[PDB]
Amino acid sequence: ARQVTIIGAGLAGTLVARLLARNGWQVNLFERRPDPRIETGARGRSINLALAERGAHALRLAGLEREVLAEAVMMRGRMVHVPGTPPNLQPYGRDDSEVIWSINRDRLNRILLDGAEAAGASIHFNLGLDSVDFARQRLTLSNVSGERLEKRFHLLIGADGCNSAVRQAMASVVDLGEHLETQPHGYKELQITPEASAQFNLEPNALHIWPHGDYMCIALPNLDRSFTVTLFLHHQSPAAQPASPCFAQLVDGHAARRFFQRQFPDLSPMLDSLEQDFEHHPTGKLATLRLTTWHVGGQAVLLGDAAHPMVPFHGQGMNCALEDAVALAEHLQSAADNASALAAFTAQRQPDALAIQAMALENYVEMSSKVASPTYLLERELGQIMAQRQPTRFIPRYSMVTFSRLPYAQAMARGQIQEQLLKFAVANHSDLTSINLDAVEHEVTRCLPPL
Ligand SMILES: Cc1cc2nc3c(=O)[nH]c(=O)nc-3n(C[C@H](O)[C@H](O)[C@H](O)COP(=O)(O)OP(=O)(O)OC[C@H]3O[C@@H](n4cnc5c(N)ncnc54)[C@H](O)[C@@H]3O)c2cc1C
Numbered sequence: 001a002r003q004v005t006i007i008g009a010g011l012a013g014t015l016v017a018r019l020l021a022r023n024g025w026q027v028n029l030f031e032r033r034p035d036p037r038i039e040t041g042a043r044g045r046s047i048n049l050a051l052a053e054r055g056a057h058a059l060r061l062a063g064l065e066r067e068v069l070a071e072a073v074m075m076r077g078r079m080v081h082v083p084g085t086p087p088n089l090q091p092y093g094r095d096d097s098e099v100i101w102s103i104n105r106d107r108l109n110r111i112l113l114d115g116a117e118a119a120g121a122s123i124h125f126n127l128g129l130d131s132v133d134f135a136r137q138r139l140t141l142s143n144v145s146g147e148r149l150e151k152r153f154h155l156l157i158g159a160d161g162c163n164s165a166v167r168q169a170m171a172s173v174v175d176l177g178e179h180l181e182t183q184p185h186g187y188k189e190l191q192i193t194p195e196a197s198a199q200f201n202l203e204p205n206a207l208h209i210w211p212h213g214d215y216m217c218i219a220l221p222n223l224d225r226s227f228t229v230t231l232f233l234h235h236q237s238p239a240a241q242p243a244s245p246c247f248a249q250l251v252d253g254h255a256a257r258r259f260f261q262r263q264f265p266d267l268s269p270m271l272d273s274l275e276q277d278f279e280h281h282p283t284g285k286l287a288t289l290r291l292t293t294w295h296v297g298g299q300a301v302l303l304g305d306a307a308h309p310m311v312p313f314h315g316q317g318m319n320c321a322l323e324d325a326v327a328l329a330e331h332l333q334s335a336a337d338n339a340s341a342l343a344a345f346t347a348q349r350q351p352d353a354l355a356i357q358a359m360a361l362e363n364y365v366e367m368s369s370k371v372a373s374p375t376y377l378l379e380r381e382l383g384q385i386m387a388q389r390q391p392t393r394f395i396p397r398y399s400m401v402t403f404s405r406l407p408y409a410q411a412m413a414r415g416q417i418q419e420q421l422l423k424f425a426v427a428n429h430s431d432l433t434s435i436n437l438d439a440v441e442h443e444v445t446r447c448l449p450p451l
């Protein structure tokens with residue numbers, strides 16, 4: 001009676017499992033990793049994520065928001081660390097009282113798994129999808145230890161991440177028209193201990209950034225006052241500058257230390273285990289991957305990172321994946337057949353995914369310049385003034401993405417109109433006093449309707 005098989009008990013897969021099982025679907029969820037709810041003496045290396053209104057609202061629909069927020073650290077603003085000034089807290093939003101939540105990935109995953117099982121989903125861990133035969137609707141799963149399993153499916157949901165095996169298998173039965181846009185930046189995950197964070201008075205209730213042009217660090221807080229730090233830096237040196245910093249040069253921990261002490265002097269002292277973490281934590285790859293479609297008939301569909309890998313510079317990948325899960329469950333529950341459901345899900349979500357993929361790419365330059373043209377600065381100055389005058393019409397794209405549930409595609413479209421307005425108003429002006437705010441405001445209401 002309405003059967004579904006989900007590959008990937010990650011963020012999207014576990015949430016859609018709950019929503020469907022809730023609705024009376026027979027749900028089986030297969031996961032390559034062990035069950036994180038089985039307590040061990042290990043301590044999780046806390047990947048932590050920014051949870052925004054979008055993501056929170058998706059959890060709210062599933063009745064899990066309260067539980068997740070109880071284990072999330074409130075970030076009331078962005079702490080920018082740049083040389084020559086003390087830490088600069090930029091309160092989020094307008095009233096200076098919007099927030100973003102920092103949630104440990106594993107804690108969130110545990111809560112979602114309990115939610116799925118509570119709803120009736122059956123979860124099987126330590127089983128990795130190897131292949132799919134779409135003519136027989138058969139799956140082949142394996143473990144590096146315990147071995148081989150063949151299973152039929154009725155409907156298959158690929159929630160199996162940026163390297164989706166389901167996506168790989170689908171490419172045969174439909175042209176996905178995939179295009180990968182590789183990212184010159186890699187990333188490295190590092191840690192600040194509770195001890196060091198207190199010693200240097202690092203603010204727990206904020207998102208911290210250390211901008212440095214073509215490379216940067218960010219840090220998100222944990223409940224225990226530790227911070228998870230991410231370094232974004234080129235894999236290799238580029239043609240135009242063959243000796244600029246990159247991972248290729250940082251051949252060991254001592255090299256990494258030299259790099260931090262020079263380029264991030266206030267951060268380095270806080271990274272006690274920099275050498276170890278650097279050598280034992282693998283260097284991550286970033287990329288944007290776009291598909292023309294996310295489903296094969298009514299047989300299988302992709303969502304979350306499986307459907308739309310994006311660069312992490314907007315902190316929205318998880319948020320988008322949770323939104324996807326809600327949308328997929330809604331379509332599966334209102335459709336003439338599964339094929340129509342999957343096509344309608346794709347038509348709804350694919351434009352939104354394209355929009356956040358593009359917006360995330362652009363968000364990099366915003367975070368990490370702190371070298372900005374006076375034109376860019378004047379544009380920002382003007383945009384804040386416009387938001388003040390017309391709070392209902394002019395909403396900074398970042399706020400639309402982060403603090404509202406307006407569809408990504410709409411946020412991009414309005415952001416584009418706002419961008420045009422500002423640039424034409426600011427062009428060939430040295431400063432703000434030459435700008436006629438009245439003329440500019442007139443254009444905001446002309447070109448920008450209320451939501
Ligand atoms: C450095 C970095 C920082 C980020 N920061 C943020 C942020 O601040 N905010 C935000 O919203 N997003 C952030 N993201 C992105 C976010 O992590 C993802 O978009 C999100 O995890 C996608 O969720 P998902 O369910 O689609 O995929 P995943 O969470 O990756 O889950 C897929 C699940 O796939 C299982 N799986 C994989 N292959 C198989 C297989 N073959 N067989 C069975 N199971 C398999 C995976 O093991 C896992 O259990 C960040 C990403 C990176 C890299």
Ligand SMILES: Nc1ccccc1C(=O)C[C@H](N)C(=O)O
Nearest residue numbers: 050218312313314315363367402
């Ligand atoms: N939270 C993150 C995690 C990892 C990488 C980037 C971010 C961000 O950039 C989010 C922030 N809202 C920003 O765009 O300025």
